[PDB]
Amino acid sequence: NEKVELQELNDRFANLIDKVRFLEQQNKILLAELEQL
Amino acid sequence: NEKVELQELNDRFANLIDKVRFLEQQNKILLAELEQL
């Protein structure tokens, strides 16, 4: 059923974006630390 | 079209997956470098 399936991909897309945000922030923090060292 | 809207859907899903993959790989190298310092 393409209502539950297209709400599923949505949830996967959402989780992937949260992951992207988290990782972008951490890599920026790590780079800043390296810059400071 | 429905076929030319589903393809787009699969392409953004792939791009998003790749972004996560690269961010994690970049993150692991940054952690390793900070670790040396």
Amino acid at A11: D
Whole-angstrom Cα distance, residue A29 to residue B17?
A: 22
- Report chain A residues whose CB lies below 8 A from the CB of B29: none
Pair B20, A24: CB distance under 8 Å: no
Pair A12, B16: CB distance under 8 Å: no
Pair B16, A16: CB distance under 8 Å: yes
Interface test with A, best of B8, B12, B18, B27 (most A CBs within 10 A): B27
The structure was resolved to a resolution in Å of 1.8
Method used to determine the 3D structure: X-ray
Pair A17, B18: CB distance under 8 Å: no
Distance of CA A14 to CAs A25, B3, B15, B17, Å? 17, 23, 14, 12
Contacts of residues B12-21 at CB distance under 8 Å and 24 or more positions apart, as own/partner, are B12/A13, B13/A9, B13/A12, B13/A13, B16/A13, B16/A16, B16/A17, B16/A20, B17/A16, B19/A16, B19/A20, B20/A16, B20/A19, B20/A20, B20/A23
Domain residue spans of chain B = 1-37
Interface test with B, best of A23, A25, A35 (most B CBs within 10 A): A23
Q: Is A14's Cβ below 8 Å from some Cβ in B?
A: no
Whole-angstrom Cα distance, residue B6 to residue A6?
A: 11
